């Protein structure tokens, strides 16, 4: 059945709740972003109103064939009325088109649902600064102090410098980057830019990227693999067997692969700085796991919450075990006692 942390009290609304059939009492289904664990259940046969960003609505129409009459895109940073309730969509700093949602309940309660997010100090100067938030529905993916990672800017600097050096030493090297969803486009786009190449990919993935409103995208991507020396493949193919296979397909144009797997966190982060990352190598194939995250680190999450000072926190991630739930609640209480709210 639909869990309570997907329902907005005092409304008929749900958030990321498309796999439970008809939720009794639901007049409007919000979708924070186009990732499969959140959209699971949507299709051309859906006949209730879906509220989301413009980019998410492009993906619903083109990838899932949801009928246009049920897609309700909202502009960001704009007070809107939905079924008699004021709402605002804010940028979540997650993947393209991802939003947080501010609900202003008729009784005076203000609720923020972060969706998935990477907390940032820039959020402290949005429309959130303007009123008090009472309840926070929080993306707790990495809510434990072991989870540190570098800035996205540091990680892209590492990837650009690594790729540029490799291809300048060997102009017959191919760069490959893995993907299994939208998000993390900066990785492959930054590397193609420094090398003077377009990124080559499948027709399915090209279609997906053409929904994202990224400026000048026609200049950066292509379905012609032969004309490109940065290729995108499914994340599942980023291993020695899959890469050896791919190299066969390129017909002797290339004699080396340098491949990137943008993981979330990996326990090399507890010890290893970004400067010190090394690849796994077999023969003429090297694989780099780089910690490019689109979720908050522990410290970024803590700063956001201690700034916002909510009265009540409802976690939306890691809620399935008692040990996880009790650990998170202990951190929430520390943060509140340290900051004095
Ligand atoms: Ni996500």
241 with 253: CB under 8 angstroms?
no
Length of the chain in terms of residues written? 341
- Burial of 54: CB neighbours in 10 Å, binned 0-12, 13-18, 19+: middle
d(CA 228, CA 234): 17
User: Residues 25, 75: one domain?
Assistant: yes
d(CA 195, CA 23): 50
114 with 30: CB under 8 angstroms?
no
* Solved using: X-ray
d(CA 198, CA 178): 16
User: Residues 78, 107: one domain?
Assistant: yes
- What is the rounded (10 degree) CA torsion for 293, 122, 158, 233? 40
CA of 142 relative to ligand 1 center, distance in Å: 13
Backbone φ and ψ for 44, nearest 5 degrees, come out as -60, -15
CATH of residue 329: 3.60.15.10
User: Residues 30, 106: one domain?
Assistant: yes
Number of domains comprising the chain: 2
d(CA 231, CA 224): 10
Neighbouring CB atoms inside 10 A of 26's CB total 18
The token pair that represents 71 in the structure block: 């897609």
d(CA 327, CA 323): 6
CA of 256 relative to ligand 1 center, distance in Å: 33
Domain extent at residue 273: 148-295
**Cβ neighbours of residue 185 closer than 8 Å, sequence gap 6 or more:** 96, 209, 212, 214
Q: Which residue has the tokens 């939306």?
A: 316
**Cβ neighbours of residue 241 closer than 8 Å, sequence gap 6 or more:** none
The angle formed by the CA atoms of residues 29, 34 and 38, to the nearest 5 degrees, is 55
User: Residues 157, 120: one domain?
Assistant: no
User: Residues 338, 240: one domain?
Assistant: no
User: Residues 335, 289: one domain?
Assistant: no
CA of 255 relative to ligand 1 center, distance in Å: 36
User: Residues 130, 107: one domain?
Assistant: yes
User: Residues 67, 128: one domain?
Assistant: yes
User: Residues 262, 301: one domain?
Assistant: no
43 with 27: CB under 8 angstroms?
no
CA of 203 relative to ligand 1 center, distance in Å: 23
267 with 151: CB under 8 angstroms?
no
CA of 16 relative to ligand 1 center, distance in Å: 11
The token pair that represents 14 in the structure block: 């749900």
- What was the resolution (in A) of this experimentally determined structure? 1.4
Backbone φ and ψ for 38, nearest 5 degrees, come out as -95, -35
314 closest CA partner among 113, 116, 26: 113
Backbone φ and ψ for 164, nearest 5 degrees, come out as -60, -50
CA of 192 relative to ligand 1 center, distance in Å: 25
């Amino acid at each position: 059945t639909c869990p309570f942390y997907k329902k907005i009290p005092g409304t008929g609304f749900t958030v990321d709740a498309f796999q439970y059939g008809v939720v009794e009492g639901c007049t409007a289904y919000f979708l924070t972003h186009f990732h499969s664990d959140h959209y699971a259940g949507l299709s051309k046969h859906f006949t209730f109103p879906v509220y989301c960003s413009e980019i998410t609505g492009n993906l619903l129409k083109n990838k899932l064939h949801v009928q246009e009459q049920y897609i309700h895109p909202l502009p960001l940073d704009t007070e809107c009325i939905v079924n008699g309730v004021k709402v605002v969509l804010l940028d979540a700093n997650h993947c393209p088109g991802a939003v947080m949602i501010l609900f202003y309940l008729p009784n005076g309660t203000v609720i923020l649902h972060t969706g998935d997010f990477r907390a940032d100090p820039s959020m402290e100067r949005s429309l959130l600064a303007d009123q008090k938030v009472h309840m926070l529905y929080l993306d707790t993916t990495y809510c434990s102090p072991e989870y540190t990672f570098p800035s996205q800017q540091e990680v892209i600097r590492f990837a650009i410098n690594t790729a540029f050096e490799a291809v300048t030493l060997n102009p017959h090297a191919l760069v490959v980057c893995g993907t299994y969803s939208i998000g993390k486009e900066k990785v492959f786009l930054a590397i193609a830019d420094v090398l003077g190449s377009k990124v080559g990919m499948s027709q399915e993935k090209y279609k997906t990227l053409q929904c994202l409103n990224i400026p000048e995208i026609n200049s950066l991507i292509t379905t012609d693999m032969c004309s490109s020396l940065v290729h995108l493949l499914p994340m599942m193919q980023i291993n020695f067997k899959g890469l050896q296979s791919h190299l066969k397909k390129c017909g002797g144009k290339y004699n080396q692969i340098l491949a990137f797997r943008p993981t979330g966190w990996t326990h090399s982060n507890k010890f290893t700085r970004i400067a010190d990352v090394i690849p796994q190598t077999k023969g003429n194939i090297s694989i780099y796991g780089i910690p490019y995250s689109e979720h908050s680190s522990y410290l970024e999450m803590k700063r956001f919450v201690q700034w916002l000072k909510p009265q009540k926190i409802i976690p939306t991630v890691n809620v399935g075990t008692w040990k996880s739930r009790s650990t998170m609640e202990k951190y929430f209480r520390e943060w509140k006692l340290e900051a004095g709210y």
